[PDB]
Structure formats: structure tokens, C-alpha cells
Structure 1
Amino acid sequence: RILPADIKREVLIKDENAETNPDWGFPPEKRPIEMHIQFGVINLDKPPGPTSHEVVAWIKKILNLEKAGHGGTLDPKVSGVLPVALEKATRVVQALLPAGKEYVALMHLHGDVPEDKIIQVMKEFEGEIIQRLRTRKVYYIEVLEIEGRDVLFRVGVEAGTYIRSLIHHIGLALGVGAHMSELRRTRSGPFKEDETLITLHDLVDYYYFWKEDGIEEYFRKAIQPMEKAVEHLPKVWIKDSAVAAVTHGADLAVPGIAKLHAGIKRGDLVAIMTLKDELVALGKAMMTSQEMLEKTKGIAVDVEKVFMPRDWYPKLW
């Protein structure tokens, strides 16, 4: 039950001294509700019926937003985790779309099969699979329940994997054939079913509670800081004196690094965090975590997408 998102990362220290000045920046739980939204993401539990595109359209019109992009397009009949990135945080979906997903699926067998076969055979589908022509990875498959011809199971997959099709091929491997009668996505990258997974109802309500009734709490818990959309990425934390430079398009030179995750490799997508754990920008590593640690000069991260505004930190340079 392990997606790559899950791999454990140790945090290495490069400069013990580095401290961050509390006058500068806005840590996620220190952002006026308005700015919390501008840099927010919704862990939405898509209802069945609508297309994911229509859903986000209802949200823009009800929350009065001008931009909002959801990650991996859930099919109409499918429910569950649909991350909706908001306004100025829209472009973080680019950390999501690639990330592994998990679903709970109900497969209906067209014929009778012993509970042992079903399990044995479904285990054979872990690894790689071809579909259309493209190859995609099944990380794990877990059967929860078999009631006669109905098989309920969790599955973890690479992005872009077609569950309906997989269930089809299982039916074929079993002989009797099969179809998927129900599907729900329980995970997409860092977004899981937890207290942050809000339904449309709870959401549009909490909004009115704040906007019309003046209660913030509930609506603030509904929006997550963009930093959440990055929990799965390797991070390097940078000094205060380096933050403004980076939001102005400066690549990140070694000397501006405070701490970093272990096991970063050249080419890896990394997130660039301030010491207050704010997301500054996304980038591509030009060094391994070890090179960065020992070296005293050089470009460590090609900055590619900047999210933090240029006025949060002073132009120290």
C-alpha cells in the first residue's frame, strides 16, 4: 500500500544558524482569509453525476472566483478526491496531475469464480499494464470484500491509469468477464480522505457562513494552503536573503540553502520553501542533495514556476 508520494525523506541541515524574520512573509496559518483563498487549494469530494469541469465551474460562480483548475479529470459517474487549485495557486496542479492516485472500485463478475482465483489473479495485475497505446503502473491491489459476484477492492496507480479498463482485463483473465459498477477516488498525490476532504454542500455553506454570517473558522478549514499541494515533493529550504531573489527569477545558488531533503537527484522536481515553510517556487534540481550540502557555490535549482509575490520579502540582494 505504498505510492511513491509516500517515500520517507530525511531532512539534512546545511546552515544551522539561519533564522527567519517574523515581519516578512505569511505562513499559511497567518494569512488573512482573503489571501488564504488567493493561495488556496480545495480537497474536494466530487459528487456523482457532473463532469469535473462543470463542478469547478459551479465553484467559480458561487465563490466568485476568476480562476480555478482541478487536477486529474474524474469521469462523470465517479466520486471522491478532486483537488481544486485556486486563483493564484492554480499552477500547483502541475505537482498533482503526475502524482499517483488511489481508487476503491466495485467490480461485477459476469460469472461465478471461487474467492481464491479472484485474489490470485488480481495479484497478477500489479506491475505494468498496457491500455489505449500506452503503458501505466499498478502499484498495489488490495481486495477488501467479495460478495458472490461482486468484488470490492482498493487500487493504487500511476497517473492516467484507466480502472474501468483494468477491471475489464481482470474479467478476461478470469474468463467470465467483468465490468466496473462503481468507482471512487480516495487519494490523489498528497490529497487523502481526512478532515480536509469537503463535499460541495459543506463548502458552499461554510462560504455563506463566512460571507453572510461572518464566521471564518469553517470556511478557512475548507481551503488548504498551497503548501499542501507540495507535501509529496522533495524540498529545499532557503535563507531569508535568498527569497526575494528567487521570486524575481533568480536560480537558487547553493549559498542560499538552509536545509534540504535527502536523496534529491539532478532533474528532480523540487519545491522551494522559506524557513517559515512557505512555498516560494517550484524548480528542477541541478545537483544531488549531497553536492548541494558540501559545495559552497553553484546553481542548485533552476527556478521554473514562482508562486510567492515579490513584495512579501525585501529585495535584500
Structure 2
Amino acid sequence: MDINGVLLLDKPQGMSSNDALQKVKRIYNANRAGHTGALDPLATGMLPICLGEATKFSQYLLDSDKRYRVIARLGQRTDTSDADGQIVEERPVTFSAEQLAAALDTFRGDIEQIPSMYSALKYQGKKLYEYARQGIEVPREARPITVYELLFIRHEGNELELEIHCSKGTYIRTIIDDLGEKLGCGAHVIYLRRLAVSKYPVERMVTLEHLRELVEQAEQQDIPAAELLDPLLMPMDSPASDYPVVNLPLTSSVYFKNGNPVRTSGAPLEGLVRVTEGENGKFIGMGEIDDEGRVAPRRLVVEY
């Protein structure tokens, strides 16, 4: 009876996303757990953790939009593009308000970006950061990303604060590093927090410290930690909330769960769909409309 669901963790500053994920996995005594998009050690914010069967649908969040609040230090460029790196260039901040306004605008909409060597992108079976730490640079192609919104928050002294809503795989550190160059003074990230992933309620986000306080409380009150921990989870199908839901009577789901495509009344002409059973509307997995217009099973939840 493993736990299935999504925990919206507020990642602690300085901790790697994997380390945060593993601590949560242990707190929930889960058999399987994965996160839906890493945050740098320096960053904090929403790190969705899929537990149990929920990991099967992590791709929908890995590919979703995200929103960040960032503060850049102007006048200094670092090798990592953030405060955890080494300063490689230092120049005077001399741009004008008009120049800043123009530079920021070049990052709005559909743009292209060459990611930092300090990233988890793969190159011949190894992460780019592995080469970076060895003092080895490798060729990287520019990747298309979309900045849905970029809000200028403030420019005070050598600090520039922005809020960015972007598509999956967008490197804020690179937008900032690139911006620093366009501004003629260089820049690096000194503050970064992911405010949200997709449409998840920011109010459901919980800190690692709060999880530990609940574990402590459960012991204090002599009750299963699950009684206090499980209510914090979003449904295991929440990662696929964007897709239409199709319900099948139990007489049809039995074949569906055996790998057979099935016909149903309410079903879209195409695309992926969440599939539920009987009246209780139990989620049994993801399906997909095939040629015959049938709902074919794609990724199902284990039965038992």
C-alpha cells in the first residue's frame, strides 16, 4: 500500500533537488519518488514531488510552464551565472533606463537560448555540469523557449529584480547572464525562487521544515505520520489535469486494463485523456484516442 500523490515542496536554499526529493521520499516512506523539474541549489520554491504511481505522469509537469522571481547582481559575471560560482568579469554599470527597457523586451515571447555548461542537459551520456567541473566546454545548440511574461520589478543600486513566466527548460541564469552582456556590465543570479509550476495552488506548497514538524507532532500525539502527511498531497492524476477526463463503466474498464482499446460515449476525437472507472470515478491511468476513435490504454496505474 504505497502512497500515491504529488507533494508541492518548497525547496530549501542550498539543497540539491535530488537531496530534497530523497528526504521527502523517506518522510513519506514511499517506494518510488521523482521530482518534475530541478531547481538550482541556490534557488528555493516549488519542486513538485511525485510519489508512487504519480511518477508515471511526471512528463506533463516536466513539460509545463513555470514562474520565477529573480534578483540579479549587475556588474559581475560568474562562471555558473549565479552566486555559487566564481566571478569571471567585473565591469561598471552604465546602461540607461531606456537601454534596460529595450534589453528586457528582447527576452519576451518566443526566443532562443544556449544553456549554461552548468546544467543537467546531456552530452554523450554525461551531464554538462560534469564537463564544466573538469574545465571542459562542449558545443551546445540554441534551444527555443517562450517567455510568456517578464515583469520589471525594480532596479536599485546593483540589483535588478524581475518576475518571469516561461516554458519548460528555460534557464533563468542564462537569461540573466545574456541580459548582463546586452547591458554591457555583466550579471549573475543572487536570488531565485520558483513561485509556481503550471497551475498548482501556491498555497498548497509546504516547506521541508513543516514536514518534519508534522512528523514530530505525529509522534508526540502517538498517531501515524500518514494522518498528518497524506492530506498535504495533490491527487496522483493532478499532473494530467490539463487533459480531458473520460469515464468508463466497469464493464469496459476490465478490457481496457487488459491492454484493449475501448469505445465510450464521451470521448474526444484525439489526444491524451485521463481515464476513470465506474461511478466513484476512480482514476486508472492515461489513455489515447486511436484511429478507430477508441480510447487506447497508454499508461495505467497498478491494480492489485
Determine if the TM-score, normalized by the shorter chain, exceeds 0.5: yes
State whether structure 2 residue 103 is matched by structure 1 residue 124. no
Instruction: Give how far 1:211 is off.
Output: 5.7
> Which residue does the alignment assign to 1:301?
295
Matched residue of 2:275: which SS?
A: strand
- Per-residue CA distance 1:202-247 (angstroms, 9 max, x = gap): 1122234346622766423322221322222333333343333322
Matched residue of 2:294: which SS?
A: strand
State whether structure 2 residue 196 is matched by structure 1 residue 231. no
Alignment of 1:15-30 (within 5 A): none
Please tell me whether the aligned partners of residues 103 and 187 of structure 1 are also in contact (alpha carbons under 8 angstroms). yes
Percent identity of the aligned residues?
25
Matched residue of 2:57: which SS?
A: helix
> Which residue does the alignment assign to 2:80?
none
Matched residue of 2:39: which SS?
A: coil
Scaled by the length of structure 1, the TM-score of the pair is 0.72
State whether structure 2 residue 215 is matched by structure 1 residue 207. yes
- Per-residue CA distance 1:163-200 (angstroms, 9 max, x = gap): 10111111222222221111111112243411x10111
Partner Cα distance (2:159, 2:58) in 1: 35
State whether structure 2 residue 62 is matched by structure 1 residue 97. yes
> Which residue does the alignment assign to 1:154?
163
Partner Cα distance (2:269, 2:146) in 1: 22
> Which residue does the alignment assign to 1:183?
192
> Which residue does the alignment assign to 1:9?
none
The equivalent position to 1:280 in structure 2, one of 281, 284, 297, is: 284
Partner Cα distance (2:42, 2:303) in 1: 42
Please tell me whether the aligned partners of residues 269 and 293 of structure 2 are also in contact (alpha carbons under 8 angstroms). no
Matched residue of 1:245: which SS?
A: helix
Q: RMSD across aligned C-alpha pairs, in angstroms?
A: 2.5
Aligned letter for 2:111?
E
> Which residue does the alignment assign to 1:65?
30
The equivalent position to 2:273 in structure 1, one of 270, 275, 282, is: 270
The number of equivalent residue pairs is 257
Instruction: Give how far 1:70 is off.
Output: 0.9
Aligned letter for 1:177?
G
Partner Cα distance (1:88, 1:99) in 2: 19
Query: Structure 1, unaligned stretches of length 5 or more?
Result: 1-34, 288-297, 312-317
Aligned letter for 1:143?
F
Query: Structure 2, unaligned stretches of length 5 or more?
Result: 76-92, 116-140
Matched residue of 1:186: which SS?
A: strand
Give the direction of change, closer, same or farther, for the CA distance of 1:177–1:279 in structure 2 (3 Å limit): same
Instruction: Give how far 1:80 is off.
Output: 0.6
> Which residue does the alignment assign to 2:176?
167
State whether structure 2 residue 36 is matched by structure 1 residue 42. no
* Bigger mean CA offset, 201-210 vs 92-101: 201-210
Partner Cα distance (1:212, 1:281) in 2: 38
Please tell me whether the aligned partners of residues 109 and 150 of structure 1 are also in contact (alpha carbons under 8 angstroms). yes
